[PDB]
From a paper:
For a detailed comparison, the structure of the [2Fe-2S]-[name] was determined at 1.8 Å resolution by the molecular replacement (MR) method from the structure of Zn-[name]. The structure is well superimposed on those for homologous proteins of other species, especially with bacterial ones. The redox potential of the monomer fraction was determined to be 320 ± 4 mV. As for the stability of the [2Fe-2S] cluster, the brown color of the sample was not faded by the incubation for one week even in the presence of 10 mM zinc chloride.
Rieske protein [name], one of the three subunits of the bacterial cytochrome bc1 complex, functions as an electron transfer pathway in the photosynthesis of photosynthetic bacteria as well as in the respiration of aerobic bacteria. [name] has a hydrophilic globular domain containing one Rieske-type [2Fe-2S] cluster and a single transmembrane α-helix. The globular domain is exposed on the periplasmic side of the plasma membrane. [name] consists of two domains, an iron-sulfur cluster-binding domain and a large domain.
Author numbering:
A (entry chain B), B (entry chain A): 49 to 194
The structure:
Amino acid sequence: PVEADISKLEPGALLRVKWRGKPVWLVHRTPEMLAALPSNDPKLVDPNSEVPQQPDYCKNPTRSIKPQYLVAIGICTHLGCSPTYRPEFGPDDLGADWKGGFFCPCHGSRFDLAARVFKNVPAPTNLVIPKHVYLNDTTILIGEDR
Amino acid sequence: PVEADISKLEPGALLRVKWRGKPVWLVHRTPEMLAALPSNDPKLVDPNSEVPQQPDYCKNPTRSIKPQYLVAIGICTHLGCSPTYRPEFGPDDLGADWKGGFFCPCHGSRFDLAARVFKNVPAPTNLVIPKHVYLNDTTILIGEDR
Ligand code: FES
Ligand code: FES
Ligand SMILES: [Cl-]
């Protein structure tokens, strides 16, 4: 397992740590980012995380233990590129209704800020969330849980 | 880093985990084993761990964070063989005054239960102790400390 120190992870920032040769992202979500997540539901493939792409303690609307932080494996579920992080709302290239999320540059799959995949892109499932647990408020252990 | 679950490590037992290609041993020491350590001092090369073969939080008489468990890399400091674990006191082959420890089969180097090397053997230093930290009472994370 690897320890992720989020003590300096500012609002909207993304921290990358390596685990089992894979990139693990930790995103500090703002209330604004969180407020828009439910609105994505109708446009998502698996808004309720029914596909087991995460431990049960992350099978929820924000796919996380705490709303303030998203923890997920930064690998596209289509073929494995690493998606770009696009937290800004409504950029011209992604559409005015874009509420922040991730965009895979290899074949266009899109995921929201709970790493849930949108309908009709090559990726068929929400990004994988690894087992993890908070050791304390500013330290998340990735790879193992209680 | 590598997690070592010592929840089932009984008194006197030794757990082996692999870290960076190296064998890491975790030994559950009994009070009897601990009681005998100071007596080895006069016969040891570096009883106070002056040679930096370990992190500072292990630079002490039991070369460990807690007395109950010894954590060390199981590689002989002489030429690299893997020492045998000999916890029993006074076996005929090692001597009646033997208080438990390690015996390297390749050229006879001896180390005590704090992994400290005895005088006049081929190995010149105490076995290396890797950086590590307790995640909780029965879980040790090897390869990192904070
Ligand atoms: S690898 Fe991500 S859209 Fe194909
Ligand atoms: S390698 Fe251990 S005594 Fe030589
Ligand atoms: Cl081994």
